[PDB]
Design a protein around this ligand. Structure first.
Ligand SMILES: Nc1nc(=O)n([C@@H]2CS[C@H](COP(=O)(O)OP(=O)(O)OP(=O)(O)O)O2)cc1F
Ligand SMILES: [Mg+2]
Ligand SMILES: [Mg+2]
Lengths: 545, 388
DNA sequence: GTCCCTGTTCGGGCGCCG
DNA sequence: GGGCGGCGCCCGAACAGGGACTG
């Protein structure tokens, strides 16, 4: 039937009217499906016949539902969606099975014709006009309108509110019309409560047909198979083509990202790099050797069987993190040693220049937020980084950075800083004064150094910038110096970059500089204000100009 | 009620709610159940397009709901000098008094907020306010007359006590002994049924190193620091100290200071004691607060409105530490000082990654207000400039 | 000011759910 | 074959803020 719930008042955007789009041709099979659906809905009062007093229209069509032979009726409401007021969505995220707790009894049920049971604002019905190749208008929520998900979710919450009040210890995970219902009752009392809930929904016009009433495990829910003590992800079929287009790569990367929630070790960076600057989806992208190897490793790890467990709130949450190359990290969240709640990846490249301690801190932040969402608390961390390494980093780093309660794990590759700048100048190390200049008109530049031991060198550069010439001068000093070197620089840009101790950069010049720095034994980098006559920065400035 | 409007050409807040822990969500559910049963708030739906984040804080097992009205306050239509000189100043939460005045009906849609659920078991539950909400700019303004009528007798019987109101707090300053100050505060708490020490706050000046032996590196660092400082104090001179660095010398070479350089350094030490000239507080501009982490639990901060025209400079010196917690505490201290001095909160340039701060800052907040802030990839040079 | 560099946000494609 | 909303991922475009530079 139709819910006797009150309607949600909606309005068009100011100064706009309803859509007047013309119906496009449809297949006779789609036409028959639509006429059957529409006769049924018109009998029940969910759609109403209209006349010439309705000047609006919007095209309709139908798709095959997930069920065998059922058709879903859709309306291309893109125009009305443009004209319609904004809403605040109430779906704040997706529930995850690792956040479920052990329940004695579980039921999964689904509301039949969910949208078509919630009434629509009368004043708005005018704008939902369509024509089946007979014209109708919607008295209920249509599928294709942008305001339907939020209105249905809010109405569902209002409907479930009295039952949740009366039954606070029955847990109802309410995704749009799918309801997971868990209780600590024996199976008979649980079924009695389920009948109470079904009668409550039916009182509010929401049927729960038996064909979608799951009463025994494994429960199919949100793309998972829920067992009493374990949960698995419904199987992921990754494409196995020989030619790869951009759309195929996007599909494969999406499937791998979806898989990484329970399969450890998934990597997508080399496959994602194939999508730089590509014009359209049909563009064929030949796989890189690195992308080939990454795909092979993912395919191999996807062959093993894996499952998750449910959350016990009387025990600790533990997130353990592992590092791979290319700025990629995996993590497992568990409570018992080899019983994962879930897994995940982290591969974001934050900034032009970074190191592994920064990326570990960022992964910790991401995992912390995800855990706050799923379980409402922060986990204890196991990290492949010495306490002394982190002590050094956060002692010498100018930014506020903090990792929550954590302990060291002995699994390589350990996170380490690859070089250390000195706090004091080095006795016995030659002193390089470096500088670079660039002409903003011709883009020609020079970089170079003088030394307290009489050496000077100047390199000419084309198609360069001031910052680039400063970095080149530092690089030249690193090239032409011994294992220990004092460098006085002009540029707080280059100084700020190097002081952060990057091991990875998108700049090739900064990568060469990093290589040199790792090769050295002691490096001291000092700064002086430019153009102040401070020797021997004065000499370098005169030279590179 | 009084009609309240937004600023011309401005819409309401549309800020998404951030994840909350289980204890905060439970505290908010209980508080909102009580507020709804008392008529203070009402459930709303998605046809209201506005939203403002909400969370909770636990002070001293009693939780307090805190709504982040920064955007709404910023979009809403538009001071005792002796308070900063009082011996003791107590902060009193008087926000509950706002729940007795109804809110303009057409304005209520802008105060919407959403309570989330653990693991997204349930869509966000949305409410709007029916009364003057705590943390909104309009609440003290609209309640001002009632507050003055309440506080008139206590001010009359105590003319030497300074009571100032910021958004949800009364700052009560007295010069008498502790123990009697608490007695007067208790008397005022009795009257409201109808611990700071500002005279000890100190300024952290810029100081130059004192050595018996100076290397080329020491003098280069000193010259850089003085060249920066001369942007604030034009009396700083660097010529004679820079003279000692002519040529291409080794950083560890020892340079003896001439009489000229010694006199110049002494003059510069003296100049850094005088206060900055021509620094006038602009009520129409924002207070900018910069913070630098100096390490070992040390933090420096400057409050200014124009570059190099510092209104104040100071430090926060804590002693297995937590950088984020110390930074939030320093932010709250600086904001309290700014409220006491100028009656306004500053906009903070925070030396921290955005995600770190937004992940952990609500775990250490204890104030009823929230200042504006932004995040900075700070330069180590300015960090060296304010070192101690 | 302009030019360069870096960081944020938002919108596009895909994936998952209904 | 398409329409809708949420979340996720990654990438490019637009925009903001700050530093160095010319003459
Ligand atoms: N692809 C989809 N687009 C949608 O707009 N919906 C919306 C949001 S959830 C709602 C569910 O509707 P119905 O109950 O009519 O359809 P259903 O296949 O989920 O279930 P049923 O056939 O009525 O038992 O339809 C679902 C989709 F799968
Ligand atoms: Mg259904
Ligand atoms: Mg230079």
């Amino acid at each position: 039937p139709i819910s006797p719930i009150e309607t949600v008042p909606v309005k068009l955007k100011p100064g706009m009217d309803g859509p007047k789009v013309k119906q496009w041709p449809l297949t006779e099979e789609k036409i028959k499906a639509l006429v059957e659906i529409c006769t049924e809905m018109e009998k029940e009062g969910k759609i109403s016949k209209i006349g010439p007093e309705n000047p609006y229209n919007t095209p309709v069509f139908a798709i095959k539902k997930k069920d065998s032979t059922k058709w879903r009726k859709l309306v291309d409401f893109r125009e009305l969606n443009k004209r319609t007021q904004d809403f605040w969505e109430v779906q704040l995220g997706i529930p995850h099975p690792a956040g479920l707790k052990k329940k004695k009894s579980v039921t999964v049920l689904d509301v039949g014709d969910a949208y078509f049971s919630v009434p629509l604002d009368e004043d708005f019905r005018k704008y939902t006009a369509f024509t089946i190749p007979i014209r109708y208008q919607y008295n209920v929520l249509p599928q294709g309108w942008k305001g339907s998900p939020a209105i249905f979710q809010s109405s569902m919450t209002k409907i479930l509110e009295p039952f949740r009040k009366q039954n606070p210890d029955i847990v109802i995970y309410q995704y749009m019309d799918d309801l997971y219902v868990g209780s600590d009752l024996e199976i008979g009392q649980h079924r009695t409560k389920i009948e109470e809930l079904r009668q409550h929904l039916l009182r509010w016009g929401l049927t729960t047909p038996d064909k979608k009433h799951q009463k025994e495990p494994p429960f199919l829910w949100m793309g998972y198979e829920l067992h009493p003590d374990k949960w698995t992800v419904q199987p992921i079929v990754l494409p196995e083509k020989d030619s790869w287009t951009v759309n195929d790569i996007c599909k494969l990367v999406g499937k791998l990202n979806w898989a990484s929630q329970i399969y450890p070790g998934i990597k997508v960076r080399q496959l994602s790099k194939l999508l730089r600057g590509t014009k359209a989806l049909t563009e064929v992208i030949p796989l890189t050797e690195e992308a080939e190897l990454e795909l092979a490793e993912n395919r191999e790890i996807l062959k093993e069987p894996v499952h998750g467990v449910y959350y016990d709130p009387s025990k600790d949450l533990i997130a353990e993190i592992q590092k791979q190359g290319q700025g990629q990290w995996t993590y497992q969240i568990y409570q018992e040693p080899f019983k994962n709640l879930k897994t995940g990846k982290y591969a974001r490249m934050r900034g032009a220049h970074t190191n592994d301690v920064k990326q570990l801190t960022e992964a910790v932040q991401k995992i912390t937020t995800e855990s706050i969402v799923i379980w409402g608390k922060t986990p204890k961390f196991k990290l492949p980084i010495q306490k002394e390494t982190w002590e050094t980093w956060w002692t010498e780093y100018w930014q506020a950075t903090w990792i929550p309660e954590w302990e060291f794990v002995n699994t390589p590759p350990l996170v380490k800083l690859w070089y250390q700048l000195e706090k004091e100048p080095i006795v016995g190390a030659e002193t390089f004064y470096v500088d670079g200049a660039a002409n903003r008109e011709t883009k020609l530049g020079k970089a170079g150094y003088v030394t307290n031991r009489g050496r000077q060198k100047v390199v000419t550069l084309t198609d360069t910038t001031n910052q680039k010439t400063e970095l080149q001068a530092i690089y030249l000093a690193l090239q032409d110096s011994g294992l220990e070197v004092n460098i006085v620089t002009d540029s707080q840009y280059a100084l700020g970059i190097i002081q952060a101790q990057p091991d990875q950069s998108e700049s090739e010049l900064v990568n060469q500089i990093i290589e040199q720095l790792i090769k050295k034994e002691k490096v001291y980098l000092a700064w002086v204000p430019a153009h102040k006559g401070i020797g021997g920065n004065e000499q370098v400035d005169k030279l590179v100009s | 009620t009084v009609p309240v409007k937004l600023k011309p050409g401005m819409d309401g807040p549309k800020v998404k709610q951030w994840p909350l822990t289980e204890e905060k969500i439970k505290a908010l559910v209980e508080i909102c159940t009580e507020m709804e049963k008392e008529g203070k708030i009402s459930k709303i739906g998605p046809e209201n397009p506005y939203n403002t984040p909400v969370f909770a804080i636990k002070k001293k097992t009693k939780w307090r709901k805190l709504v982040d009205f920064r955007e709404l306050n910023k979009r809403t239509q538009d001071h005792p000098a002796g308070l900063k000189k009082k011996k003791s100043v107590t902060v009193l939460d008087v926000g509950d008094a706002y729940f007795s005045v109804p809110l303009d009906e057409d304005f209520r849609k802008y105060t919407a907020f959403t309570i989330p659920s653990i693991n997204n078991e349930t869509p966000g539950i949305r409410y709007q306010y029916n009364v003057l909400p705590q943390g909104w700019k309009g609440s003290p303004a609209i309640f001002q007359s009632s507050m003055t009528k309440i506080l008139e007798p206590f001010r009359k019987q105590n003319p030497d006590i300074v009571i100032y109101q910021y958004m949800d707090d009364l700052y009560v300053g007295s010069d008498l002994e502790i123990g009697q100050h608490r007695t007067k505060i208790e008397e005022l708490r009795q009257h409201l049924l109808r611990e700071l020490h500002p005279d000890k706050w100190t300024v952290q000046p810029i100081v130059l190193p004192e050595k018996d032996s100076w290397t080329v590196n020491d003098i280069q660092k000193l010259v850089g620091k003085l060249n920066w400082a001369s942007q604030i104090y034009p009396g700083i001179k660097v010529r004679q100290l820079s003279k000692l660095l002519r040529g291409t010398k080794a950083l560890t070479e020892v340079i003896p200071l001439t009489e000229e350089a010694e006199l110049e350094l002494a003059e510069n030490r003296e100049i850094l004691k005088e206060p900055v000239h021509g620094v006038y507080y602009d009520p129409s501009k924002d207070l900018i607060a910069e913070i630098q982490k100096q390490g070992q639990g040390q933090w420096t901060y400057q409050i200014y409105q124009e570059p190099f025209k510092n209104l104040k400079t100071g430090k926060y010196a804590r002693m297995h530490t937590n950088d984020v917690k110390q930074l939030t505490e320093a932010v709250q201290k600086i904001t309290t000082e700014s409220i006491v001095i100028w009656g306004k909160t500053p906009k903070f340039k925070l030396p921290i990654q955005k995600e770190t701060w937004e992940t952990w800052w609500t775990e250490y907040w204890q104030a009823t207000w929230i200042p504006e802030w932004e995040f900075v990839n700070t330069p180590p040079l300015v960090k060296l400039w304010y070192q101690l």
